[PDB]
Amino acid sequence: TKGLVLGIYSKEKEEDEPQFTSAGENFNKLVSGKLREILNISGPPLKAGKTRTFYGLHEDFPSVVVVGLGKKTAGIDEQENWHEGKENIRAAVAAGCRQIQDLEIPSVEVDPCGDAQAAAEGAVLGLYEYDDLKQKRKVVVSAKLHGSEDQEAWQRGVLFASGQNLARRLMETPANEMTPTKFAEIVEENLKSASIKTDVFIRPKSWIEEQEMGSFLSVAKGSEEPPVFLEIHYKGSPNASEPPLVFVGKGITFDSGGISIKAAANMDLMRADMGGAATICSAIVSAAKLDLPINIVGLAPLCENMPSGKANKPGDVVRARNGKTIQVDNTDAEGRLILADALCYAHTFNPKVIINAATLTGAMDIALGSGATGVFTNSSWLWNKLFEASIETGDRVWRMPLFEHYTRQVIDCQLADVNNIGKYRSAGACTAAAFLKEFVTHPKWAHLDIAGVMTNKDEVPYLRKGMAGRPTRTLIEFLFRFSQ
Amino acid sequence: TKGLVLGIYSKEKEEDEPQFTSAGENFNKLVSGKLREILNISGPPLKAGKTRTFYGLHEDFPSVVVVGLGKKTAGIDEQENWHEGKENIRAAVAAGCRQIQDLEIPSVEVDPCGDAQAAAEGAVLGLYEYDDLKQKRKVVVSAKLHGSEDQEAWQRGVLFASGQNLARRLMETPANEMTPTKFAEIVEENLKSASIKTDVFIRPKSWIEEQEMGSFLSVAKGSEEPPVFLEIHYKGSPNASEPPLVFVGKGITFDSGGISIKAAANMDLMRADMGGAATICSAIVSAAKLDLPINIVGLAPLCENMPSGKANKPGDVVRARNGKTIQVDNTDAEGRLILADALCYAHTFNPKVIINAATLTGAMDIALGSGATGVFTNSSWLWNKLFEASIETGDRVWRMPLFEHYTRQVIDCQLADVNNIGKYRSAGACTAAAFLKEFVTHPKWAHLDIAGVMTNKDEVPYLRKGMAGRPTRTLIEFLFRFSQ
């Protein structure tokens, strides 16, 4: 019927016993001390992220899962660059919800754990699973707030987590279903449901040609799947003329590498090479849901990178919208090609800031793995804003260098103005970033290389194995704070 | 006979002609305007780092090389994290000196260029070449300050550059000559020449065994070359009891990878796998030369990593000095093994700070290349001190993360307390750093992964192709400022 998730903290030195949250304390009282009694009988105390289940304590809650929240006053961890208490809550609540789901319980009430937004994030991110294409599926669990005192915060958590889950769905869906057109249609419907103060333009190939986006076009042509340039507007500012914030995302729905073909092992994960587009578009959907008082534009060039008799050939020179020529030495360095055109187009909006996201390089994965998203930016103010937002969400960012040292290695080009792969194999994420900078003149630009945080195995406790949708929540938080 | 290097700046908008430095202006006057006249006749102005040679202008200087210094007031570049003017001077002066050397001139006087230390660094780092083992050698050039007004600063530059050149020599020398014993003897003689307030102990294998350094010993045994543990003391503090600063360096004189053998291509560069030891030992020699008022201890475990019938075998478990067990899954991840024992020993000195350097991972090279040394530290105060020092020297540092996220991947171990390679291939530099942290309890520790800055092709203009000796000057600067 109905399950209940309650939290308990680690015992502090002067306490005689570990303390329940307010809800746990109230429930124990409701059952005349039976919860504390049974917890004591069960043995060792619950530590952070651990769970234990007690049956039959109340007729309304046949299964009660108690979860360890760790130290009650855990705040910002100076060494980890995140709010520890929030992370403990997300992990603990996710673990509790997965136990409720294993017991095949369709609905669960969740203890706010002193921070309803974090509790909601743990439950909603934790229960998520992409199973539309399977016969065998786990029970669908409906999680709601236990109590009625922390509603806005709980709902805020549901909203943030839902945005990330939308990104996860888009990334996880196989490329034959999640084509450029399909991705555009799903984003279009989600944005329109979020707010009527939106406009969506799924720009066709003819428009792309009119816009002289030769770099983007060169990538798309190898495949039979039609390319599209998704342009979305959210008019949240009270002043329609207020300069917008522009987000740009790499939308390669499937990357085979092209003529510079990839190895077979785990190439299926490349269905998520559109993660950059997924995260920035989902962030905008969420911003619209929150009705943030700001104008935002989202740009996402979308296409496949396939080998064929029409595909990009190593050595080919293409002309970007801005007139710059690019020597395509490696057709698998295609994300930067489509981004060159989208970044150029972004300047036409005279934006306040330009932020792009892309599952750009394997080098980024070798550099930081799934620990944090690499951020390249010409603005310390912007770096700081993204960094502060990440401490709150727990979806960490780490700064990477934008030095001429790297630029020199990409403009040293045999046939053109810029080469699409560096002179050497070193610092691949840095030279890719340098390539992108040659198409940016804006003073507040940030490039997020999310290749290393594309998937999750078990690193983030509250995300099941699969595409991660990171760092969608950090982007939403940045926008929220920016709007305030 | 004697050559002369003079600088000229880029012309500023309201100037009628580009301005010479004070020395260039004085020389032009000495030759009745002949320098300006000929420079004008030669054509286009000289830009940063470019040079032009004029003959017969003065009987004392048959060859005068004018070098472009760029913008006179170039200060700290916010985007590049270095003092630009100093970098322009080092590059320009090095280029000028190389031209003088090509003309086979044995002595040259160098314009201080508004910053004698930077000019001296450009000349001394710029002319350096390891050619002891060649029949054919370029002319030995003796560079001295032009004038007598900037002596202390010029000499400071010579000292800093000489320290780096010592590191370069140690790194460049072939491993059959630069053995553990030889490296120790060369460092010993250099430290003793620098100051009488020093003690050097080239600890033998019996001492290593007595110290129960099983991890270090396991690496050394595969080779026939005797291992040594170099321990150096510089007693510069007025108070002999003042806690020392401790530097630790990885001294693998040659790394074949061991049983987990390396590929053949460019394996010769592994003669520089002792770069960590070279840089920290050279920094200490320089600190002693400067007679900094501080106590410093240098620790450098030295040995070869070779395959044989006695070598480390994948899966073997070894016991570190601190009692922790380590599963040696990959024998090529040997630097962290010898460092575990040296870092443990470092705590016995009750130091103020512990800084280690190591050409540790190929991942670091993939991460940042030769743009900057990766720094992992549990102290933002220490990060800041190293960062500020690097702005001054131009030998840049960049912070990398020390997160439990990475620790989890190395303590998840089948047979022991810690595994010498991570669970996954991602973030190799980060998991290596996490491994090292398991052997550190000190509150002010920094690990410098210098694998990416081991060599120079043409990235640093003032360093000829070969082993770089980076970031020796940043370490010297840190110590200088610390002492003040």
Ligand SMILES: [Zn+2]
């Ligand atoms: Zn997909």
Ligand SMILES: [Zn+2]
């Ligand atoms: Zn690709």
Ligand SMILES: [Zn+2]
């Ligand atoms: Zn791609």
Ligand SMILES: [Zn+2]
């Ligand atoms: Zn050597």
Ligand SMILES: [Zn+2]
């Ligand atoms: Zn090795």
Ligand SMILES: [Zn+2]
């Ligand atoms: Zn090594």
